[PDB]
Amino acid sequence: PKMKTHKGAKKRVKITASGKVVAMKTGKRHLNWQKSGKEIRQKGRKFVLAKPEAERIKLLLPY
Amino acid sequence: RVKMHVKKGDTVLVASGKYKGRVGKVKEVLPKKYAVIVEGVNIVKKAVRVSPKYPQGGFIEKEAPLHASKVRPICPACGKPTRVRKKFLENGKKIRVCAK
Amino acid sequence: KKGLAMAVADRAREGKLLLVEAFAGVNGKTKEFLAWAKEAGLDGSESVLLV
RNA sequence: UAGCGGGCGUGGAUCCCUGGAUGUCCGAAUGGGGGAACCCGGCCGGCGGGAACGCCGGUCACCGCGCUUUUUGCGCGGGGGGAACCUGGGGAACUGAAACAUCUCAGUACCCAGAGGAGAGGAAAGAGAAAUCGACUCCCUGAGUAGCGGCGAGCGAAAGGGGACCAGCCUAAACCGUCCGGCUUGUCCGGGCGGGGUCGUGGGGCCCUCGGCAACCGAAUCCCCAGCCUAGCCGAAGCUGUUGGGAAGCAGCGCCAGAGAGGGUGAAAGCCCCGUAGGCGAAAGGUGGGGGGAUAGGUGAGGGUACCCGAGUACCCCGUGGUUCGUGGAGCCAUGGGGGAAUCUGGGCGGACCACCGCCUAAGGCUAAGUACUCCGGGUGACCGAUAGCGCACCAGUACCGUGAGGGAAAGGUGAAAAGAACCCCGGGAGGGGAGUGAAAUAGAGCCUGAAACCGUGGGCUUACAAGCAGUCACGGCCCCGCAAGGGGUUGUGGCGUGCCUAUUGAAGCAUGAGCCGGCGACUCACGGUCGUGGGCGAGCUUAAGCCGUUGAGGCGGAGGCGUAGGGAAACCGAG
Ligand SMILES: [Mg+2]
Ligand SMILES: [Mg+2]
Ligand SMILES: [Mg+2]
Ligand SMILES: [Mg+2]
Ligand SMILES: [Mg+2]
Ligand SMILES: [Mg+2]
Ligand SMILES: [Mg+2]
Ligand SMILES: [Mg+2]
Ligand SMILES: [Mg+2]
Ligand SMILES: [Mg+2]
Ligand SMILES: [Mg+2]
Ligand SMILES: [Mg+2]
Ligand SMILES: [Mg+2]
Ligand SMILES: [Mg+2]
Ligand SMILES: [Mg+2]
Ligand SMILES: [Mg+2]
Ligand SMILES: [Mg+2]
Ligand SMILES: [Mg+2]
Ligand SMILES: [Mg+2]
Ligand SMILES: [Mg+2]
Ligand SMILES: [Mg+2]
Ligand SMILES: [Mg+2]
Ligand SMILES: [Mg+2]
Ligand SMILES: [Mg+2]
Ligand SMILES: [Mg+2]
Ligand SMILES: [Mg+2]
Ligand SMILES: [Mg+2]
Ligand SMILES: [Mg+2]
Ligand SMILES: [Mg+2]
Ligand SMILES: [Mg+2]
Ligand SMILES: [Mg+2]
Ligand SMILES: [Mg+2]
Ligand SMILES: [Mg+2]
Ligand SMILES: [Mg+2]
Ligand SMILES: [Mg+2]
Ligand SMILES: [Mg+2]
Ligand SMILES: [Mg+2]
Ligand SMILES: [Mg+2]
Ligand SMILES: [Mg+2]
Ligand SMILES: [Mg+2]
Ligand SMILES: [Mg+2]
Ligand SMILES: [Mg+2]
Ligand SMILES: [Mg+2]
Ligand SMILES: [Mg+2]
Ligand SMILES: [Mg+2]
Ligand SMILES: [Mg+2]
Ligand SMILES: [Mg+2]
Ligand SMILES: [Mg+2]
Ligand SMILES: [Mg+2]
Ligand SMILES: [Mg+2]
Ligand SMILES: [Mg+2]
Ligand SMILES: [Mg+2]
Ligand SMILES: [Mg+2]
Ligand SMILES: [Mg+2]
Ligand SMILES: [Mg+2]
Ligand SMILES: [Mg+2]
Ligand SMILES: [Mg+2]
Ligand SMILES: [Mg+2]
Ligand SMILES: [Mg+2]
Ligand SMILES: [Mg+2]
Ligand SMILES: [Mg+2]
Ligand SMILES: [Mg+2]
Ligand SMILES: [Mg+2]
Ligand SMILES: [Mg+2]
Ligand SMILES: [Mg+2]
Ligand SMILES: [Mg+2]
Ligand SMILES: [Mg+2]
Ligand SMILES: [Mg+2]
Ligand SMILES: [Mg+2]
Ligand SMILES: [Mg+2]
Ligand SMILES: [Mg+2]
Ligand SMILES: [Mg+2]
Ligand SMILES: [Mg+2]
Ligand SMILES: [Mg+2]
Ligand SMILES: [Mg+2]
Ligand SMILES: [Mg+2]
Ligand SMILES: [Mg+2]
Ligand SMILES: [Mg+2]
Ligand SMILES: [Mg+2]
Ligand SMILES: [Mg+2]
Ligand SMILES: [Mg+2]
Ligand SMILES: [Mg+2]
Ligand SMILES: [Mg+2]
Ligand SMILES: [Mg+2]
Ligand SMILES: [Mg+2]
Ligand SMILES: [Mg+2]
Ligand SMILES: [Mg+2]
Ligand SMILES: [Mg+2]
Ligand SMILES: [Mg+2]
Ligand SMILES: [Mg+2]
Ligand SMILES: [Mg+2]
Ligand SMILES: [Mg+2]
Ligand SMILES: [Mg+2]
Ligand SMILES: [Mg+2]
Ligand SMILES: [Mg+2]
Ligand SMILES: [Mg+2]
Numbered sequence: 001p002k003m004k005t006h007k008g009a010k011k012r013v014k015i016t017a018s019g020k021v022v023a024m025k026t027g028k029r030h031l032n033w034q035k036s037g038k039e040i041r042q043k044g045r046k047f048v049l050a051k052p053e054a055e056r057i058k059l060l061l062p063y
Numbered sequence: 064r065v066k067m068h069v070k071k072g073d074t075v076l077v078a079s080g081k082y083k084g085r086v087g088k089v090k091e092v093l094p095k096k097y098a099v100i101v102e103g104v105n106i107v108k109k110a111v112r113v114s115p116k117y118p119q120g121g122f123i124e125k126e127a128p129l130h131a132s133k134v135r136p137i138c139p140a141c142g143k144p145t146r147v148r149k150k151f152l153e154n155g156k157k158i159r160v161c162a163k
Numbered sequence: 164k165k166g167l168a169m170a171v172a173d174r175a176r177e178g179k180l181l182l183v184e185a186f187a188g189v190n191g192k193t194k195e196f197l198a199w200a201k202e203a204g205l206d207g208s209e210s211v212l213l214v
Numbered sequence: 215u216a217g218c219g220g221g222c223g224u225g226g227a228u229c230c231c232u233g234g235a236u237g238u239c240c241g242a243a244u245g246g247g248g249g250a251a252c253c254c255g256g257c258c259g260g261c262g263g264g265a266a267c268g269c270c271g272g273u274c275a276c277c278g279c280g281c282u283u284u285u286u287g288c289g290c291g292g293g294g295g296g297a298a299c300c301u302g303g304g305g306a307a308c309u310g311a312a313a314c315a316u317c318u319c320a321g322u323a324c325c326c327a328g329a330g331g332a333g334a335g336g337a338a339a340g341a342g343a344a345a346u347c348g349a350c351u352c353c354c355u356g357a358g359u360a361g362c363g364g365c366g367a368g369c370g371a372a373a374g375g376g377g378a379c380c381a382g383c384c385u386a387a388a389c390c391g392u393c394c395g396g397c398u399u400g401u402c403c404g405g406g407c408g409g410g411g412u413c414g415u416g417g418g419g420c421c422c423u424c425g426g427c428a429a430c431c432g433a434a435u436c437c438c439c440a441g442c443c444u445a446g447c448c449g450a451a452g453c454u455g456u457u458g459g460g461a462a463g464c465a466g467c468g469c470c471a472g473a474g475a476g477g478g479u480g481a482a483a484g485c486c487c488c489g490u491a492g493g494c495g496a497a498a499g500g501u502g503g504g505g506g507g508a509u510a511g512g513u514g515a516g517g518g519u520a521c522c523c524g525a526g527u528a529c530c531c532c533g534u535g536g537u538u539c540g541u542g543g544a545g546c547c548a549u550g551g552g553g554g555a556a557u558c559u560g561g562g563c564g565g566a567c568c569a570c571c572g573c574c575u576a577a578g579g580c581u582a583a584g585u586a587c588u589c590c591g592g593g594u595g596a597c598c599g600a601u602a603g604c605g606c607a608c609c610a611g612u613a614c615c616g617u618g619a620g621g622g623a624a625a626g627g628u629g630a631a632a633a634g635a636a637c638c639c640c641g642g643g644a645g646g647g648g649a650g651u652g653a654a655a656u657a658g659a660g661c662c663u664g665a666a667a668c669c670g671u672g673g674g675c676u677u678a679c680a681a682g683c684a685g686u687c688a689c690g691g692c693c694c695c696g697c698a699a700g701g702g703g704u705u706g707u708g709g710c711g712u713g714c715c716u717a718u719u720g721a722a723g724c725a726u727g728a729g730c731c732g733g734c735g736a737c738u739c740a741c742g743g744u745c746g747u748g749g750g751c752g753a754g755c756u757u758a759a760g761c762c763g764u765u766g767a768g769g770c771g772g773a774g775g776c777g778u779a780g781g782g783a784a785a786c787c788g789a790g
């Protein structure tokens with residue numbers, strides 16, 4: 001009883017005001033070596049999901 | 064306790080079933096079963112004798128008890144409910160307006 | 164609230180509501196209130212919520 | 215609980231309440247033994263002729279505490295049990311992580327010791343950011359927040375705010391007197407007793423100066439009482455006719471109601487009975503601060519000096535436990551090992567450490583209420599109604615099963631009333647047939663109702679040249695219903711035709727399950743989500759625990775929650 005927020009999610013995702021869900025781009029802490037400077041500049045911008053946005057949101061709700 | 068009820072060995076009207084209207088003295092009060100025998104509800108017990116002793120016992124059609132509810136006490140009138148009332152000491156039941 | 168008001172209202176728009184004060188049938192005794200009832204037109208023909 | 219056979223009661227029995235008496239033997243079991251309910255004794259006294267024997271009454275277990283001269287004694291107490299609740303000492307695994315070891319399940323299950331109508335906790339060496347709060351416990355909220363986490367599974371606080379309850383106390387030490395023991399006579403060494411003392415505006419001790427107190431407070435201890443509990447009592451109002459086996463139904467007139475809750479009476483009763491509303495009651499036991507009374511206790515201001523303020527403790531380190539905290543920057547609380555102080559210029563704490571600013575006074579104990587539970591009594595159910603409801607409506611923790619721990623059933627109903635069927639008849643009996651009772655006997659005694667499977671008797675249609683998932687369609691014959699057109703039962707020939715469920719690409723299938731009937735039998739609820747939908751209100755909407763009502767009446771209660779601003783990891787900025 002009383003759903004608990006998924007801490008794992010909250011620690012890496014945000015609900016936007018319109019109900020979207022965003023997170024940092026993957027693949028930018030390792031594979032790094034000299035990947036085009038362009039790549040890593042674009043691995044900085046965060047993005048929105050799609051369907052797991054809904055899977056994701058459910059894991060919150062008090063949030 | 065509590066087993067007490069309407070009245071005792073005395074005069075009474077049967078407002079019951081088949082013996083409605085009939086009236087007479089109650090010869091026995093059974094407090095446990097809550098019954099009384101008067102002179103009504105006579106019933107023939109075809110049976111021989113009632114005990115392992117003596118020969119002929121007769122079809123003694125003697126009275127069968129009645130639910131104490133169907134009999135009502137009575138005094139200078141006709142079927143008056145009971146009402147207890149105490150004097151300067153003890154206690155005696157005056158009928159609906161009279162006494163005893 | 165609304166319900167309470169609306170109920171009292173419904174029974175007013177209906178005409179059945181009646182305010183009083185002239186309770187001469189005081190003194191807790193059914194027969195008295197029974198007498199006051201007739202005078203007030205509560206012939207006991209209809210159920211009543213006496214508040 | 216009837217019967218045989220005898221008794222008692224208005225000189226007030228039975229029965230109910232309180233207290234008392236008697237209470238074999240076993241059981242903590244306690245003189246000793248023992249295979250519980252048996253066996254055997256010591257001492258004092260009694261009974262029989264009573265020395266031998268036996269019976270009767272009393273007494274004799276063990277441990278702890280205190281007096282008792284070590285000795286023997288004397289007194290007070292402990293031992294065992296209890297459904298659940300409680301505390302402490304120990305403490306799993308399946309399981310979850312879709313494997314598994316950290317982790318989870320969980321300090322759960324269980325074992326053990328103890329406490330009591332409760333138990334625990336409890337008057338800050340606290341909280342933690344307000345220069346704020348002010349014992350403890352309980353509820354709501356804060357909050358699924360802060361955090362914790364093979365940052366996986368998952369786990370998950372506190373401050374604060376709203377409520378219930380409300381309460382505060384006693385000592386150790388410095389100091390003085392006394393008693394006993396000790397030496398090397400000292401306001402001295404130890405022990406016991408009394409006085410003194412008890413807190414963080416730090417307090418107390420000892421000295422100087424003021425009352426040299428009437429007073430003011432006052433119990434959690436006693437005493438009286440009210441009230442209440444353990445039996446009870448009073449209690450309004452109805453008759454007639456009618457149908458019937460039986461009124462309480464139907465009808466006619468009438469009444470009570472602080473009582474029209476419910477139950478019973480041959481059916482369906484406010485006024486017949488038991489009650490209900492409303493009132494009354496204790497000699498005796500239990501309870502009893504709610505009221506009253508008493509006692510125990512309890513308290514003022516400055517100055518001086520530095521006597522005291524709980525030790526193998528604080529403190530540090532090694533090993534761990536607790537907390538939201540899993541070694542993490544890891545404090546705090548607790549402590550198994552090693553080292554080891556100070557008495558306010560003293561110590562602990564505010565999350566490593568240092569400084570600053572503040573909080574609190576460890577190393578002794580006690581404390582009501584609000585809280586938990588339900589063996590027991592009572593009240594009430596949009597709770598069951600005999601395969602249900604407790605395992606048990608009934609002679610059940612029984613029968614029966616098992617060496618044992620343990621397992622554990624089935625089984626309720628005649629009728630209003632036994633009026634339980636005299637008597638006759640067939641029969642060894644059982645059981646029937648009459649007679650009889652009853653409204654009813656196909657209510658006849660494991661007897662209301664009496665379904666289905668299953669067995670049988672009688673009647674109608676049908677069958678011995680016939681090939682079948684048993685039926686359906688058509689026509690014909692026979693039998694039966696209605697004046698009739700018609701309908702019912704049956705089946706001769708003809709046409710047609712691969713059971714039901716399950717599982718499968720596919721089943722009549724030689725794939726699954728079912729002997730048949732009856733009854734039991736499987737998508738629920740709680741909390742939190744997310745949509746949809748019916749309404750209330752709207753930049754607002756809504757209360758939680760609780761309090762006041764009520765006894766199937768609701769109101770109060772804004773603490774708190776969602777919404778009115780987003781973006782950023784954040785500092786921060788803001789329709790950006
Ligand atoms: Mg990364
Ligand atoms: Mg290249
Ligand atoms: Mg009367
Ligand atoms: Mg007897
Ligand atoms: Mg006699
Ligand atoms: Mg007695
Ligand atoms: Mg006894
Ligand atoms: Mg004994
Ligand atoms: Mg013994
Ligand atoms: Mg023994
Ligand atoms: Mg002799
Ligand atoms: Mg002898
Ligand atoms: Mg002795
Ligand atoms: Mg012993
Ligand atoms: Mg011992
Ligand atoms: Mg000992
Ligand atoms: Mg001695
Ligand atoms: Mg003594
Ligand atoms: Mg004593
Ligand atoms: Mg005990
Ligand atoms: Mg253990
Ligand atoms: Mg495991
Ligand atoms: Mg395992
Ligand atoms: Mg697993
Ligand atoms: Mg699961
Ligand atoms: Mg698995
Ligand atoms: Mg395995
Ligand atoms: Mg691991
Ligand atoms: Mg745990
Ligand atoms: Mg714990
Ligand atoms: Mg434990
Ligand atoms: Mg205890
Ligand atoms: Mg209590
Ligand atoms: Mg307590
Ligand atoms: Mg304590
Ligand atoms: Mg204080
Ligand atoms: Mg802090
Ligand atoms: Mg202040
Ligand atoms: Mg605070
Ligand atoms: Mg406060
Ligand atoms: Mg809460
Ligand atoms: Mg990690
Ligand atoms: Mg845990
Ligand atoms: Mg609080
Ligand atoms: Mg406030
Ligand atoms: Mg509070
Ligand atoms: Mg001491
Ligand atoms: Mg001293
Ligand atoms: Mg002295
Ligand atoms: Mg001394
Ligand atoms: Mg002495
Ligand atoms: Mg001496
Ligand atoms: Mg001395
Ligand atoms: Mg002393
Ligand atoms: Mg004192
Ligand atoms: Mg003192
Ligand atoms: Mg002081
Ligand atoms: Mg001086
Ligand atoms: Mg003076
Ligand atoms: Mg003075
Ligand atoms: Mg004086
Ligand atoms: Mg009083
Ligand atoms: Mg009282
Ligand atoms: Mg009583
Ligand atoms: Mg009466
Ligand atoms: Mg009456
Ligand atoms: Mg007639
Ligand atoms: Mg009739
Ligand atoms: Mg008649
Ligand atoms: Mg009648
Ligand atoms: Mg008249
Ligand atoms: Mg009255
Ligand atoms: Mg009726
Ligand atoms: Mg009635
Ligand atoms: Mg009384
Ligand atoms: Mg008395
Ligand atoms: Mg008394
Ligand atoms: Mg008692
Ligand atoms: Mg008492
Ligand atoms: Mg009290
Ligand atoms: Mg005195
Ligand atoms: Mg004073
Ligand atoms: Mg001074
Ligand atoms: Mg000075
Ligand atoms: Mg001086
Ligand atoms: Mg000075
Ligand atoms: Mg000074
Ligand atoms: Mg000390
Ligand atoms: Mg120690
Ligand atoms: Mg780890
Ligand atoms: Mg842990
Ligand atoms: Mg800390
Ligand atoms: Mg240690
Ligand atoms: Mg000092
Ligand atoms: Mg110095
Ligand atoms: Mg510390």
Ligand SMILES: [Mg+2]
Pocket residue numbers: 563
């Ligand atoms: Mg601290």
Ligand SMILES: [Mg+2]
Pocket residue numbers: none
């Ligand atoms: Mg510290």
Ligand SMILES: [Mg+2]
Pocket residue numbers: 563564
């Ligand atoms: Mg602190």
Ligand SMILES: [Mg+2]
Pocket residue numbers: 564
């Ligand atoms: Mg700090």
Ligand SMILES: [Mg+2]
Pocket residue numbers: 564572573
């Ligand atoms: Mg501070």
Ligand SMILES: [Mg+2]
Pocket residue numbers: 340563573574
């Ligand atoms: Mg503090």
Ligand SMILES: [Mg+2]
Pocket residue numbers: none
């Ligand atoms: Mg203290």
Ligand SMILES: [Mg+2]
Pocket residue numbers: 386524578
């Ligand atoms: Mg001490």
Ligand SMILES: [Mg+2]
Pocket residue numbers: none
């Ligand atoms: Mg203390």
Ligand SMILES: [Mg+2]
Pocket residue numbers: none
């Ligand atoms: Mg000590």
Ligand SMILES: [Mg+2]
Pocket residue numbers: none
């Ligand atoms: Mg206590």
Ligand SMILES: [Mg+2]
Pocket residue numbers: none
């Ligand atoms: Mg409960």
Ligand SMILES: [Mg+2]
Pocket residue numbers: none
């Ligand atoms: Mg229960």
Ligand SMILES: [Mg+2]
Pocket residue numbers: none
């Ligand atoms: Mg009970």
Ligand SMILES: [Mg+2]
Pocket residue numbers: none
């Ligand atoms: Mg009960």
Ligand SMILES: [Mg+2]
Pocket residue numbers: none
């Ligand atoms: Mg039912």
